[PDB]
Structures are given as C-alpha cells and as structure tokens.
Amino acid sequence: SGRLWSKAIFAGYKRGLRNQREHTALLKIEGVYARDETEFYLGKRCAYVYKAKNNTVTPGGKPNKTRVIWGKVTRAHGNSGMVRAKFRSNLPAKAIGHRIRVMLYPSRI
Amino acid sequence: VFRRFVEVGRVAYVSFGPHAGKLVAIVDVIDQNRALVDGPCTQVRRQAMPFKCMQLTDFILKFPHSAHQKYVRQAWQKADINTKWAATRWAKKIEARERKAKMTDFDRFKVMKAKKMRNRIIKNEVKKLQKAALLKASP
Amino acid sequence: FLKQLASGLLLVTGPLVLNRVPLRRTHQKFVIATSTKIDISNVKIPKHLTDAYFKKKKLRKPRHQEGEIFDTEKEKYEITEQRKIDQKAVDSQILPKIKAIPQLQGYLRSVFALTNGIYPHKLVF
Amino acid sequence: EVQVLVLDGRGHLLGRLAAIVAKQVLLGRKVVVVRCEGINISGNFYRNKLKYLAFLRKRMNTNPSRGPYHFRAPSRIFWRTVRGMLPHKTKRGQAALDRLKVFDGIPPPYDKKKRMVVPAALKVVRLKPTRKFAYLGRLAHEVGWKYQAVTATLEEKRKEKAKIHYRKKKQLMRLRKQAEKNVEKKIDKYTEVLKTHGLLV
RNA sequence: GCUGGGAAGGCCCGGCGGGGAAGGUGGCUCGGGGGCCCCCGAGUGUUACAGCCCCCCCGGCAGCAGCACUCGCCGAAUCCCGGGGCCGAGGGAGCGAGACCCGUCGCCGCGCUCUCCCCCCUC
RNA sequence: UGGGCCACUUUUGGUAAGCAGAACUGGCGCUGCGGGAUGAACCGAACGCCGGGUUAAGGCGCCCGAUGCCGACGCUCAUCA
RNA sequence: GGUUGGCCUCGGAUAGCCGGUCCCCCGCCGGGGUCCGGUGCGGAGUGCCCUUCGUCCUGGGAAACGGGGCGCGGCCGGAGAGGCGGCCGCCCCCUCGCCCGUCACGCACCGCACGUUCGUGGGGAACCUGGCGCUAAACCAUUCGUAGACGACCUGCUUC
Ligand SMILES: [K+]
Ligand SMILES: [K+]
Ligand SMILES: [K+]
Ligand SMILES: [K+]
Ligand SMILES: [Mg+2]
Ligand SMILES: [Mg+2]
Ligand SMILES: [Mg+2]
Ligand SMILES: [Mg+2]
Ligand SMILES: [Mg+2]
Ligand SMILES: [Mg+2]
Ligand SMILES: [Mg+2]
Ligand SMILES: [Mg+2]
Ligand SMILES: [Mg+2]
Ligand SMILES: [Mg+2]
Ligand SMILES: [Mg+2]
Ligand SMILES: [Mg+2]
Ligand SMILES: [Mg+2]
Ligand SMILES: [Mg+2]
C-alpha cells in the first residue's frame, strides 16, 4: 500500500581514478544532496532487488524470479549527499545506474 | 528602476550565515562588500556583514551613520519594526514555510483530508460556473 | 504502544477494529515513533500479557520420524478465546480515548506510505 | 528520477548544460533536451565560429569519409559535446549516451509538456552581463546547418498555439479564484486547517 | 583556567565638565520642486529642533572570550551521555575441597551481613 | 661484478646539445605502489594475504573518487586568451 | 527484465517581472492606454494534483445541474516525429462513493526479508474458441546488352 523505501542509485564503487575497491558501493539517495542530511540514512538497510531466470524461494511467499542482495549504509561519501554501502556480496557492475532501495528498517527515530 | 537601496537606517533581512532569519539595521557601509550591521531588538550585536547575505526590506530607520547602539534601538523601537515586519506578506510567508516544515505525520494526514474536501467543493463550483457561462446564445 | 515487555519487545495494539492489528509484540528497531500521543495512563494492561503469553507454539514433529504422511495439520493457527477476551479488554478502554480527539481513528485506519515528493529525512514524525 | 527530464535549451551555456546532462545519464536518468538552437556559448560569436571552423579542419587526410564527423545541427552539436563528457567507448557510456535525446525546436511529444531549467548552466547567472556570447543556432546556420528557417517558422507556430493554451489556463485560474470567493462559507473550515500548517497563507 | 588579572561592548536620558572637529544635525544663505505654506542639491559651522571622537574629579550595575554565534589559547585549569561502522583472535586462569554436574577464577573498583536504631513507599 | 645511467647543487671543455668529463648525496639499474594524462630517474611512499580508520604528494565541472561551500578579496577579454 | 503515483505546454525579461480591471481598436476575443494589486517570486516546481485497508448498521455536512460504463454511434481538434486529446447523442446501472461521526466485522497466521505498482508489460512458438476478410511475390533457370572480370545492372517471355 506504499513505497516504504527510499529511492537510491548505485553510482559506482569506492575508487581512486585508477583503482577500484568493489567491496563497498557509493549510493546516491534521492532528495539527499548534502552531507549533513545523510545522518538519517546511516546504518539503514539497503537492498538491490533484481530478477533472474530460475525461481528462488521467497520468505513468506511462493517461489518467484525475484532475487535480492542485502546491504547497509555505512557512512557518508563526499559533501553532496553520497553514502557508502556494504553489501553481503559485492554489487554486480550491471547494476550501476539502477535502483537501490533504502529500507528505513533500523529506525533510530 | 531601483526602489530599495543600501543606506544608513535601511532594515535588511539576513538570508544565511550565523544570523539567518534575523532583521538588522544598516549603520554604516565599508568597501562595497560589507556593512556595519546592528540589530539591537533582534539579538544581532554590532558587527561587519557581507551584502550577499542581506535582503533589503522596505523599512528605513532615521539615525546618523555610526551612531551608538542606544540610538539605533530607540529608532527601532519607535515605529517598531518587529510588529511591522510580522504584518508583512514577506514575514508570514516565512512563518508559513516554517510551520509546514514542522508539520508532523498526523498533521499531514489532517491536511490531506482538509485539502481533499476543499478541492472537491471548489472544483464542483468551477464546473457549475463553466456550465453556467456556457449558456451564451446571442449574435 | 502500551508497554515494553521483559525481553525489550514492545507490546502494541492498533485497536483491532481500526486497523486489524491485535495485541502483538514488535521490535523497537523496526518501528517509527511518531510525535502524536494519547494518554493511556490509568488503563489496565492485563498482568498475564507477558513474553511467555505471546511466544509462538508448535506441533510437529513428535511420535513421527519418517515423513510420508503430511503432518501439515493444525497449520491453521487458531485465535484462543483468551486472546479475544484480552483484546476486548484493552480496546474497550483505549478506543474511547482515541475517539476523544478528532479524526485519530481515521489516522490509525490509514497506512503510512512514501510519496515521490517527500523524503524520510525531511519528515517530522 | 525514473521519469524523463525535459530541459529547455534556451539561455543555457553549452558546456555547463552538457556537464549536468552527462552525470544525469550516467545515473540512469533519461534526459531530453529541446531547443538546442537556443543554447548559448560564452565569448563573442566570431571567436566561437573560429573554434568550429578549426574543428571543421580536423579531418583524416588519407580518407575524410572515415575522419571526424562534423555535425552541423545544434542538437547534434550539443550531442557531441555531451559525448565528450561520457565514456562513450565503454558499454556503460554507450548506454548513458542512448538515454539522451536532443532536438532542434520542440517536437510534438514534448511541446505539450512542461520543460525544466538548470540554473547552474543558465547564461543570466553564470555569465557577467557585459560579456559577449554566441547563439548555437546562428553558429550552426553559418557553418552548414540547413534548417534554421524552417525551425524558426515551426517554433513560431508552436508559440502561437502555446499562447492560446496559456489564455485558457489563465481563464480557468480566474474562474477558480472566483469559485473560491463564491464558496467561502463552506470552505473556511478547511481553509483554516491549511493555514495553520503553512499551506495557503 | 589564562590574557592588558582579556579587548570591545550593553544598561544607569551617566552625571559636574572640558576640548576637537566632520563623511556637518538644526538653523541660515543660494539654486531646483508640491497648494506665502511642505521637499532635493550646494555653501556656513561647532548642538541647535541629530549625532561622532578624546580627556575626565570619578564612575556604578549586569554579564564576561556570552544561551544577543564580534575577536583567542587551553584542560591534573574536564567531565557526562548518545549514534554509525568494522571486529570476537585466544581456550585446563581451581595452592582450593584433597577438586567430583560446566574452574561464575586472578588483578582492579565497589555493595551488604556477622551493630543497633529510625524514615518513605509496598505485602 | 669490474660497459653504467639519471636528478639537486658545485664544476671543466664546447655556441650548444637528450654532448663530453669530474665532486657530493640520493636514485634507476635491482622497484612494485599513489600522483605528474602518457614516461626507468620527478613528487609522495617503498611492497607477506586481508578488514576497518586516516593520510602523503596530488586533487574535487564531466570523463573520473572528491566543493552539489548560497567559500573570501581582487586581476583579466585575447579575430593564435 | 526494468519500475514501485501524476503534473496536459505562455512567451520571455533579468538596470526588471507577474496578475487583475475600465476606455480605445481589431471582427464575440485579442491588441494597446489608464487604474488597482503582488514581487526575496505564495496565481509560489522550496509548487500543485491524486492519495489505496475493505465492508456493515448509522446520523450530519458536500452534492443531487452526480458518478461509472475497454456500452454503442457521431463529430471536432492535433502533421515537426500528428500514434494523442476533446465534445455530443442514445443506452445501461449506483444513489454508493468526498469530509466529520455511530456501529461492528474480516485469518488477529502468534516481532522479522524479495511486501506495495506500471501490468491485462515486452518478445517467440503452440491449442481451443466466434465474426469479418485476402488469394501474392521474390529469386534461380531463360532472354536482353543501354551492362559487364565474376557478381551486380537495363530488359523480354499466349492480349487488341
Ligand atoms: K516486482
Ligand atoms: K562507538
Ligand atoms: K671478487
Ligand atoms: K674480479
Ligand atoms: Mg565559555
Ligand atoms: Mg574464539
Ligand atoms: Mg663486459
Ligand atoms: Mg669502466
Ligand atoms: Mg654525462
Ligand atoms: Mg656516452
Ligand atoms: Mg644490468
Ligand atoms: Mg638497492
Ligand atoms: Mg621504487
Ligand atoms: Mg603512477
Ligand atoms: Mg603532463
Ligand atoms: Mg585500507
Ligand atoms: Mg584529475
Ligand atoms: Mg564525481
């Protein structure tokens, strides 16, 4: 009955110009364009939800084609509202520029 | 073309910086970029202040340049700016913008209900006026 | 919100008439505390409403080792008549206080959602 | 965002607008830029024309049919400027470049839709008023573009139809304001709720 | 906490005063306006129908590197609380009963009892 | 191993040389890594396999991580900036 | 495989703008001149619109000049890529849907994730089911020589 998660974009991995650290990802959260506004989202669970070909078990539901790689926001990146996220598995590079959901689950408010 | 001028006694509204949201009076001007600034009734002590954070109002106080804070306060209190400011559309848009930001989830729900009814009553009457004005049969 | 239980889990009731949420446990780490409050002092939350009261129960799998005949019976969890009595007791004294101030039942009756305009960090709850 | 961003190119500086659009398409956003003939470039016109004429000179001496392709339409000129700010030789950059649609004038899909503006790339705020600038449409026309006149006539037709829409919109708004006055007794209850919370001052 | 035992500053119309002036108030003079009455510009000059600076014969009150965000260095002259992230390597610590169901153990910091009275809630 | 070469500075021949010859220290050779787009020698820093934090030199329109600061004060228009 | 409400549009100026109204001029609306407002844009994209728990008793308000029909039929506007938008006529149904209240109920699945939309998504074979419809070309081979290394190309082949 509602979106219940914030829209975020997987912009890329934490990196230098010529070195890429794939274990952590930089997320752009919609509406958060300054570093001082990223406090709310620190520690929040983030999910990369995608679909595949074969069915997989769904917790509390029939198996479907939806898969998910879970993660959480670790800290702020830069001065313009980017955040760094760690996922249980390094995000695939095909997801750059695609949707990441921020769950609001571990609420501190 | 210009109607609002930087001058001695001109009341300015602070848009950003440490004193954002306050009213100050211009006491003196320095080097085209900054001005001697004093708000004795708005809790801004005398200090330099860039012209970039100022937004000029329509209120001009009468006191000599670089006068002491006491005389600025007397001019500010007589024909008080605080009540005159609060009565302007400029200030009550600032206040309206403030209370909308502090609106809670329950208030958002009640506003959503009031806006729903208000729009349906208004938009009904618009249709009625349209339908009425549609009866134009004349050469 | 009624009380915190001995395990730290919160005991909540959304008056079951209003939003179909029974007397149920919940975790404070997975809720948003809004600023709107009702005075539920001098109401009596029954004493037996403890963690042991709300802890789940199971059937399988005694007297049965090799699974060839399904033991999927009982899966229809049954609402105990005691649970209905307790739900009726708490609601009978919380619902009147909800009706006291205007359009709170309608507020409890709706669900929370994120609209493409608003963002959670800008929201005051 | 998930919807298409339609940007009006009039009054926007070429490189500044291209930098914004380039990061948007790299973030998975679909961007449409219309009125690429209204894009401005800082510096007097003669100087900016010399820059493109120097671009025209760069060609493969052995076989110009393979060499740099010089596009004369303002939309393609802006398209190439964005392409210089994308990794267009990788699959990620090619995907981003395919999310950009550029047009001269405003075609029928977007003529009826509201058009956004990028203040950080606007000439009025980014350029000193005493400085000289060039119009991309004039620069394109005098270096090979062939459709400046027809685009002007079609843009003038579009503007005439837009004025009619604005008059109907204004007539509708006047009727709405009259409606609010008419039903004021049965509205003040909900007007007061809006005012207490900052809507409807 | 220190400093110029901070510098400025606020209030006490600061009061008895003195002096200086100018980014010159009032007044006056000259030049341009609105129905001989009211404005703008340029002169004059020392309070005037504004204000400014310095010295006082002396100050008083509050506050004090200010929760009116003007300008510092600090903490034996410094403590309390909260949030996010990553991590959990090690595995027989029992001088004691002569261990016996799995050493809740060492160092360190504490509380109560082997003293007696009261006080406040609660059964 | 007994072919060396390079850089700051001192320094001889030469118009000069990415030339030839010395002194001193460091380096490359034997050396990967961050930065200088690119590069034996420059700047930072030297290296077991990893996680977190922070930096150096260098950067933060876009490519391309970082200014998407309501940054400060000025200077500058170039028809080869 | 993505996605998890929409915005259906003045032209523009920036040492300026926006809105409204009476006379004048253009064949009943625009175009000007007064006049009145707003301008740190509130007729505001820092905005607006829609807003989803569902029903049952049950009153007060909004409406009642109402809603919804992949119901039909007709018409108009849109050509820059119109692939869209609007208006009537008839018909067929609800008095519901919007706000504030009364009244209880629904798996209340016993704290937990991929939930919630676009969506009757795109694409490819195939079965059944009704109506309305169609019955063609290309290439090779042959020929031509306006052509030609070979391909390719220009041509002809039961009718007056
Ligand atoms: K889905
Ligand atoms: K911590
Ligand atoms: K040897
Ligand atoms: K030897
Ligand atoms: Mg202090
Ligand atoms: Mg261990
Ligand atoms: Mg040898
Ligand atoms: Mg040798
Ligand atoms: Mg040499
Ligand atoms: Mg040699
Ligand atoms: Mg060697
Ligand atoms: Mg060595
Ligand atoms: Mg090395
Ligand atoms: Mg390198
Ligand atoms: Mg270089
Ligand atoms: Mg590291
Ligand atoms: Mg760089
Ligand atoms: Mg970047």
Spatial distance between the Cα atoms of D11 and C11, rounded to a whole number of angstroms: 60
Spatial distance between the Cα atoms of A41 and A108, rounded to a whole number of angstroms: 10
Spatial distance between the Cα atoms of D34 and D41, rounded to a whole number of angstroms: 16
Asked whether C46 and C89 are in contact (CB, 8 A), the reply is yes
Spatial distance between the Cα atoms of D172 and D178, rounded to a whole number of angstroms: 10
Strand order in the sheet with D100-102: D5-8, D31-34, D100-102
Spatial distance between the Cα atoms of C104 and B109, rounded to a whole number of angstroms: 10
C 14-33 near A (Cβ less than 8 A): 29-33
Spatial distance between the Cα atoms of B84 and B91, rounded to a whole number of angstroms: 10
Residues with CB under 7 A from strand E: A 42-43, 72-75, 86, 106, 108; B 8, 18-19, 28-29, 39-40, 43-47, 63-71, 73
**Cβ-proximal residues to A28 (8 Å cutoff; 6+ apart), any chain:** A8, A9, A11, A81, A82, D27
Of the candidates A108, A103, A46, A3, the residue with the CA atom closest to the CA atom of residue C28: A108
Contacts of C106 in chain B (CB under 8 A): 109, 113
Asked whether D14 and A43 are in contact (CB, 8 A), the reply is no
Nearest-Å Rg of the Cα atoms of chain D is 22
Spatial distance between the Cα atoms of B25 and B37, rounded to a whole number of angstroms: 6
Would you state the torsion angle of the CA atoms of residues B65, B70, B71, B76, taken in this order, to the nearest 10 degrees?
100
Of the candidates D31, D37, D1, the residue with the CA atom closest to the CA atom of residue D101: D31
Of the candidates A46, A39, A42, A37, the residue with the CA atom closest to the CA atom of residue A102: A46
Would you state the torsion angle of the CA atoms of residues B71, B77, B78, B79, taken in this order, to the nearest 10 degrees?
130
Spatial distance between the Cα atoms of B45 and B27, rounded to a whole number of angstroms: 12
Instruction: Report the Cα D69 to chain-centroid distance in Å.
Output: 23
- Encoding tokens for residue D188? 């003040």
Asked whether A48 and A87 are in contact (CB, 8 A), the reply is yes
How many CB atoms within 10 Å of residue D147? Answer: 16
* B109/chain C closest Cα distance in angstroms: 7
Distance A55 CA to G2 C1' (A): 18
- Cα-based distances in Å from A28 to A106, B50, D119: 19, 34, 21
Q: What are phi and psi of A56, to 5 degrees?
A: -130, 155
- Encoding tokens for residue D179? 């409606």
H helices of B1-139, where?
69-77, 81-87, 89-101, 105-133
Residue A17 three-state SS = coil
**Structural resolution in Å:** 2.2
Residues of A with a Cβ under 8 Å from any C Cβ are 1-6, 30-32, 37, 39-41, 104-107, 109
Spatial distance between the Cα atoms of A53 and A47, rounded to a whole number of angstroms: 19
Spatial distance between the Cα atoms of B83 and A73, rounded to a whole number of angstroms: 47
Q: Of B103, B105, B110, which has the smallest distance from its Cβ to C103's Cβ?
A: B110
Measured over the CA atoms of residue C106, residue C112, residue C113 and residue C118, the dihedral's sign is positive
Asked whether A25 and A91 are in contact (CB, 8 A), the reply is yes
Beta bridge partners of C4: C10
How many CB atoms within 10 Å of residue A5? Answer: 20
b/e code D56-90 from CB counts within 10 Å (16+ = b): eeeeeeeeeeeeeebebbbbbbbbbbbbebbeeee
Instruction: Return the amino acid letter for D154.
Output: L
Residue B39 three-state SS = strand
B41 alpha carbon to ligand 5 midpoint, in Å? Answer: 24
**DSSP class per residue in chain C:** --EE-TTSPEEEEE-HHHHSEEEEEE-GGG----S-----TT----TT-SHHHHS------TT--S-SS---TT-S----HHHHHHHHHHHHHHHHHHHHSTTSHHHHHS-----TT--GGG---
Q: What is the DSSP letter of D12?
A: B
b/e code A45-79 from CB counts within 10 Å (16+ = b): bbbbeeeeeeeeeeeeeeeeeeeebebbbbebbee
Spatial distance between the Cα atoms of D138 and D192, rounded to a whole number of angstroms: 54
Of the candidates D165, D131, D158, D134, the residue with the CA atom closest to the CA atom of residue D50: D134
* Largest interatomic CA distance in chain A: 45
Spatial distance between the Cα atoms of D164 and D170, rounded to a whole number of angstroms: 10
b/e code D111-142 from CB counts within 10 Å (16+ = b): beeebeebeebbbeebbeeeeeebbbbbbbbe
Determined by: cryo-EM
Q: Of B101, B105, B113, which has the smallest distance from its Cβ to C125's Cβ?
A: B105
Distance D25 CA to G67 C1' (A): 44
Q: At what angle do helices D188-196 and B105-133 cross, to 10 degrees?
A: 140
Contact exists between D and A (3 or more beta carbon pairs < 8 Å)? yes
A74 alpha carbon to ligand 3 midpoint, in Å? Answer: 61
Residues of B with a Cβ under 8 Å from any D Cβ are 89, 92-93, 95-101, 103, 107, 110-111, 114-115, 117-118, 121-126, 129-130, 133
Residue B30 three-state SS = strand
b/e code C97-110 from CB counts within 10 Å (16+ = b): ebeeeeebeebbee
Helix H, strand E, coil C: the string for D136-198 is HHHHHHCCCCCCHHHHHHHHHHHHHHHHHHHHHHHHHHHHHHHHHHHCCCCCHHHHHHHHHCC
